[PDB]
Amino acid sequence: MEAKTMKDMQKEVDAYIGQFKEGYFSPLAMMARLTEEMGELAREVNHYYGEERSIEEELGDVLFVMICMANSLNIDLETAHNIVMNKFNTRDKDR
Amino acid sequence: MEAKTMKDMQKEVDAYIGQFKEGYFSPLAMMARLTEEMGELAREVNHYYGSIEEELGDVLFVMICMANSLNIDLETAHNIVMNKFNTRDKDR
Amino acid sequence: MEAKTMKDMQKEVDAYIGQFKEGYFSPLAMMARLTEEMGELAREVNHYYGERSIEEELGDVLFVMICMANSLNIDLETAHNIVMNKFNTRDKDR
Amino acid sequence: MEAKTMKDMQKEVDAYIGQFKEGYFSPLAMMARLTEEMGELAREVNHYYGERSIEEELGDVLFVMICMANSLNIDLETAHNIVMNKFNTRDKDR
Ligand SMILES: [Mn+2]
Ligand SMILES: [Mn+2]
Ligand SMILES: [Mn+2]
Ligand SMILES: [Mn+2]
């Protein structure tokens, strides 16, 4: 493990977008971008599992737009992950 | 900041799924789950820009599930996308 | 009593949206709406295959499709026809 | 100049698919196909609104939907009607 934090991956994407005059796409434009990326993942999941490198890369593509979305709206995905994990966190002492 | 690495967040989800007899959804079923979560995100984005923090988390969870299912490390994924966007221009 | 045409189905949706001051969602907002409905379909496909509820969720996506098409003066009969043309091979045996 | 009914459009797709040994994709595979086409629609909506290419990509989405519907013996005219009934108001003035 190197190992990169979620905070750093977000900083890394923020640094890349920061160079452009355009900046982040508007949230609704982002949502279209995500739908587009998800389609490319769907295509690839269907190709390999329907009726590691390509499918690995299409996840990264989706993850990038997600980070963009999250950065655009000042959302920290580590926090986001934690609130989901807390929702699944059972009150059962045996687990 | 703690701060949590991508590998840790993936390990964390794998430990959660690992307790069930079922384990992971098959990839095509995952893809359906992912389409489902994306719609919930779309709803929230439209509502606020026509909750987001949580619905992004929800989509991220399914992503991690998908990646774990196929033994894919999302740090490597992120890196190979960053390499693609990385320009050979000395000025940038 | 007899089958409804795609043109009429579009006219029907246009008549319904026509009564509102706001009218059609902008194309990018429609796409968000369409993504939302697709998720509900996905949910229901997963539920039954991972009857009536799935029939309804297809209706929901079809409605937003029609809204999208109407919004951009696109006729879905014509759209469907270019797809059929794209697939209809020049093979005499088929 | 017909014009074409939804039932016929579905019959037309069923006849096209009916020639192949493989037949219809399973519902979960269909859903993946549909997610794929939606992305291509999204791409095209973003390009022009972030138009003839949108007409084609709407068609492609409509095709997979027809496939989906045929696959599960669902009539899309019926589906459309339940959605219209859902929005049908009990208001006498509308
Ligand atoms: Mn992708
Ligand atoms: Mn969600
Ligand atoms: Mn639906
Ligand atoms: Mn398309």
Contacts of C65 (CB under 8 A, 6+ apart): C34, C76, D58, D61, D62, D65
Please state, in angstroms and as integers, the Cα–Cα distance from residue C62 to each residue in B12, D34, D69, following that order. 39, 12, 11
Residue B38: which of D29, D46, A86, A62 has the closest Cα?
A62
SS3 (DSSP) at A5: strand
Tracing tokens 């995500």 back to the chain, one arrives at A34
* Amino acid at site B90: K
Distance from C-alpha of A85 to C-alpha of A79, rounded to nearest angstrom? 10
Residue C77 CA neighbour count, 13 Å, CB half: 16
CA distance D62 to C9: 14
> Which residues, chain by chain, have CB under 5 Å from ion ligand 2?
B 37, 40-41, 55, 58
Q: Which residue of D has its CA nearest to C89?
A: D16
Q: Quick check: C84 and D16 in contact, CB under 8 A?
A: yes
Q: Minimal Cα distance from C26: which residue of A?
A: A28
CB-CB contact of C3 with C62 (8 Å)? no
Contacts of D93 in chain C (CB under 8 A): none
Rounded Cα distance between D73 and D52, Å, is 31
Task: Report whether C29 contacts B50 (CB < 8 A).
Answer: yes
Q: Determine the Cα–Cα distance for residues B81 and A63; give it in Å rounded to an integer.
A: 9
Sign of CA dihedral D63, A42, A7, B87: negative
CA count, 13 A, side-chain hemisphere, B19 = 10
Rounded distance, CA B63 to CA B13, Å? 10
Which residue type sits at A9? M
Cβ contact B6:A4 at 8 Å: yes
Final resolution, Å: 2.8
CA-CA distances (angstroms) from residue D14 to A35, A44, C88, C89, D45? Answer: 28, 26, 13, 16, 29
> What does the longest C-alpha to C-alpha distance in chain C come to?
54
CATH for B1-92, among 1.10.3470.10, 1.10.1040.10, 1.10.240.10, 1.10.287.1080? Answer: 1.10.287.1080
**C-contacting chains (≥3 CB pairs under 8 Å):** A, B, D
Check residue A25 and report its DSSP letter: P
DSSP codes of every residue in D13-79: HHHHHTTSSS-SPPHHHHHHHHHHHHHHHHHHHHHHH--HHHHHHHHHHHHHHHHHHHHTT--HHHH
Q: Does A62 touch chain D (CB under 8 A)?
A: no
Is any Cβ of chain B less than 8 angstroms from the Cβ of D42? no
Q: B6 and A9 in contact (C-beta within 8 Å)?
A: yes
- Reduced to 3 states (helix: H, G, I; strand: E, B; else coil), residue C5 is strand
For tokens 């006498």, what's the residue?
A: D92
CA of residue A22 to ligand 3 center, whole Å: 34
D35/chain B closest Cα distance in angstroms? 7
**Alpha-carbon distance A10 to C84, whole Å?**
44
d(CA C37, CA A82): 27
Q: Is D5 helix (H, G, I), strand (E, B) or coil?
A: strand
Give A51-59 contacts, CB < 8 A, sequence gap 24+: A51/D22, A51/D25, A51/D26, A51/D29, A52/B70, A52/B71, A52/B72, A55/B70, A55/B72, A56/B72, A56/B76, A56/B77, A56/B80, A57/B77, A57/B80, A57/B81, A59/B63, A59/B66, A59/B67, A59/B72, A59/B74, A59/B77
How far from each other are the two terminal CA atoms of chain B, in whole angstroms? 29
Residue A21, Cβ density class (10 Å: 0-12 exposed, 13-18 middle, ≥19 buried): exposed
- Do you find a cis peptide bond into B15, omega within 30 degrees of 0? no
Q: Which of B72, B43, B75, B51 is nearest to A67 (CA)?
A: B75
Q: The tokens of C68 are what? A: 């999208």
Q: Which amino acid is at D15?
A: A
Q: Fold for domain A1-95?
A: Helix Hairpins (1.10.287)
Is the backbone peptide bond immediately before A3 cis, with ω within 30 degrees of 0?
yes
- Per-residue CA distances from D17 to A79, D25, D47, D63 (Å): 48, 10, 32, 11
CB count in 10 Å sphere of residue A88: 10
The topology under which CATH files domain C1-94 is Helix Hairpins (1.10.287)
Q: What does DSSP assign to residue C74? A: -
CA-based nearest residue to A26, from C28, C20, D77: C28
Ligand that comes closest to the CA of residue D43: 4
Rounded distance between C-alpha atoms, residue C38 and residue C60, angstroms: 9
Elucidation technique: X-ray
**DSSP assignment letter at C25:** P
- B22 burial (CB, 10 Å; 0-12 / 13-18 / 19+) is exposed
Q: Do D36 and A42 touch (CB under 8 A)?
A: yes
Alpha carbons B51 and C33: distance in angstroms, whole number:
17
Distance of alpha carbon C6 from the chain centroid: 10
Nearest to C30 by CA among A29, B25, D77: A29
B-chain CB neighbours of A28 within 8 Å are 45-46, 49-50
Buried b (16+ CB within 10 A) or exposed e, C6-41: bbebbeebbebbeeeeeebbebbbbbbbbbbbbbbb
DSSP string, B16-37: HHTTSSS-SPPHHHHHHHHHHH
